[PDB]
Structures are given as C-alpha cells and as structure tokens.
Amino acid sequence: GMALKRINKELSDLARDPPAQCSAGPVGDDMFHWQATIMGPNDSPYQGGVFFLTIHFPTDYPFKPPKVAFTTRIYHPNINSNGSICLDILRSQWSPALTISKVLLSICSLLCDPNPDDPLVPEIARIYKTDRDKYNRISREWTQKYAM
Template sequence: MSKVPRNFRLLEELEKGEKGLGPESCSYGLADSDDITMTNWNGTILGPPHSNHENRIYSVSIECGPNYPDEPPKIKFVSKVNVPCVDSTTGEVKSSVFHTLRDWKRAYTMETLLLDLRKEMATPANKKLPQPKEGATF
C-alpha cells in the first residue's frame, strides 16, 4: 500500500480545517497562507467544560516538519496553561510526557493532537489545576 505524500496529507488537513469540518472544540489552519511548504500552523482549543479551563480559548502554534506525518509535529502553547505535559516556561508540549506525541502514528492528524490535548486538560488530575490569568501568553 502506498503512503500519501506529505503535501497531499497537509492539503487534506488544510481543507478540513478551513471548512470547519472537524469538531467545534478545536480549529487549525496555516499561519501564513503563502507558506507553500505548509510548515507553520495555528490552532485553537476550547477549554473543556466543568474544568478550570472552561470558557477559555487556548492558542497553539504547530510546526509540521519535513518528515510529517511520519514524525509528530512540534506543538507549543501561545496561551499560558498549567498542564503537566506543557513546559511551564516555554509552552512546548513535552513529547516525552504527552502520550499522543510519544506514541505518534502516521494516521494521527493535527486534529487528533488538539483533541487529545483537550482530553488531557479534562482528566481528573488536570481539570482542577489552577490556571494562569486569562489572556496570559508564553
């Protein structure tokens, strides 16, 4: 079975993201529409309900390197968040801690990544953690 080339895969993700065909709890798109390499993306995660994240919108930057989707993208929170899998000084999601990055599969997408981060925020261990002031950024 042949593998879908990186650019085709990213075009599929871009189309889905731009048309809003994914869940309402997250969104993503190119950071610069002129980026022909489709490397740098912006994403948002709506804070899960019944948690200290509720009614917050978290911004992230996503970098899909040349080996994406065979290798996971780098993802970094722009909005400050207090979750153990996020470095408290840089906002980078730690691939050694966050299961989706650590156990990355080619079938995963940016949407998978954003939804799994949202689920991580909603876990019993993380949903009541005190959060930085709304609007604070890294």
Template sequence: MAQSPTSSAVRALQLELKKMKNEPVEGFRISLADDDNIFEWEVAIFGPPGTLYEGGYFKAIMKFPNDYPYNPPSVRFLTKMWHPNIYENGEVCISILHPPIDDPQSGELPSERWNPTQNVRTVLLSIISLLNEPNTFSPANVDASVMYRRWRESKDQEEYETIIRKQVAESKKDAVKDGVTVPTTVNEYCIMAKPRQMATSGNMDDFYDDDYMEDDDDDDYDNCAYEEDEDDSGHGDS
C-alpha cells in the same frame, strides 16, 4: 543539511487543512500562521465545559516535520499554561507527539506513540483530554504535577485551581481581541460533522481525502469528543 519538504507531506497537510475547514471540529479552531507555509499552523483550543478550563481560549503553534505524517508535529502553547504535561516554555509533552521508535526506558508502549494514521484532529483531541486528566507519572512540569496531585487528594488545597482559573480569565482577553465567542455549554462546544459525500469517478480528490483521513480509532469522536461528566468535580479518580 536540513531535509527538504516532501511532496507527500505537503499533500497530506493540504488535505487535512481542507477537510478540517470543510468539517469544523469540536473543541478547537485552526488556521495557517502564514498562507505560504503549510508546515506551521495556528491553533486555538477551547476549554471543555464542566472543567477548570471552561471558557478558556488557549492559543498554540503546531509545527510539522518535512516528512509528515511519518513523524509527529510539535505543539507549543503561546498562552501561559500551568499544567503537569506542559513545559514552562509552552511545549506539550504527550505520548502521541513522540516519534514512533521503540524506547523501553521511556515507559511508553510503541502503540502509545505517534504513527502515520494519526492526524491533527487526534492530536488536538488528545491534548484537550489531557487538560482535565493530566499524566502525573512522567510530568514535564514537576511543580505543577505535585500541586495537581495535592488538589486532587484534598479540597483544601486550592492553589492549583486558583492558578488555572486566573489563566482562563487571562485567556479570555485574547478571545475578545480575536473576536471569538468561546463555547461554554456542551451543545455549543460540540460541532456535528457534515455528512460525507460519495466520491465520483470524476473527483478523486474527495475520495482520497476521505480515505486518507479515515481513522478507525476515531469512532468515539464522531459526534463530540467531549462529554460533560456532571459528577466529576475534578477530584475524582482518573
């Protein structure tokens, strides 16, 4: 029998959605696929400037379990993606999306997996980082992983870059269709968060919102999660 959604899961997702709409975040946009279903979100990730993905508009679906945040969401790209850590069906394979269990055979530390202090923002920022810095040690797409390694090791191997450039170009058609202007510079890409307001005794929702969403590991992302590296052509060491 399928587990029914918990009220705490609904509350957690409502708070996250409210916070992210009130404080837009760099690198992506979110909305509900269906206003009556808080457990399925539409996501659009912008390709980071200075990378192969610059100017790209990559659409995905994020689905949440009924016991969120105790178990992780899943993320599946709708945009065609050729990437070592994305399956052919678009599903993202990344440690932060793996359940919080101790599995020595996976090669992952428990601290690398999902935990209830994570949230939508940390997941999506991790995926954005993964685009330009794939994990080729346990790939979801072996062919893409081999091609990426060859590309990193030799500038003569341009097949990987060519595929990504074509997919970026195709994704721009969706941006035009959706009426979205994709940021292509660091200044456009980075969105400064609004200052937090002090909670008052008469508005405990605001207090709970900030307290629930606070993540000590997020300090590096306070201004912008992505910083362009002018010396990184994509062929340097990870």
C-alpha cells in the same frame, strides 16, 4: 512534496467537517506553519479560556509527528513555561493514522485528565496530586489571567 500533500488533505477534511470549538490551519503562505486554537474544555478549570498553539510540520510528515507547542500560558503538570507539551502521541506513540484534529482533542483530554507521574513541571504535579481543589483554583486563576 509528500508532506505538503498530506498537510493539504488534513486541511481539506477539517474545513469540510469543522469542529464546533477548536480550529487549526495555515496563517500565511508557509503551509508547514499552522496556528491552532482550543477552547478550555467545559467542566474543567480551563473553561472560557482560549488557548493558542503553534504547529510546525516536519518535511517527512506524517511519518514523524508534528511539533506542537502552546503559545498561551497554561497551568498544567504536562505543559511547561516554554509551552512544550508532554504527550506520548507527539513522541513515541505517533502514527500516520493520527491527525492534527485528533492531536488537539487529545490535548483536550490531557487538560481534563493530567498525567502527574510523567510531568514537565514538578511543582504543578505535586499540587495536582495532593490538593485538587487548589490545583483547580490556580488553573482557573491562570486561565482568567492569560487565556481570556
């Protein structure tokens, strides 16, 4: 019952100090499944887009990281077509000091500053590294098609 209690605490804190753009919480009786939304960051190719994510807390959260994946298609070196995310805090650098909130904001920093040297989609990493304007254009094209 430890996991459920921490999931309720994060929901309380989030509800009481709401972010202005992103959001997350339960969408049903099952507290271990959350939906989250982030806005494509202003000043990025993702601007105006709304990206949905699905979160599954494990039964020994917060000592193991939540499973977080996009359900909205997105063009990015570190996010693949199944929506899996390469972000170290979701893997090796997870800590119980971290929260869904800081995970979302971190994903936003990832969107604004990709890590092409550790990619999930090699072709997108290539384009990001060699032609940023093209990368930005395609990123914007996919935002308009899939996230708006």
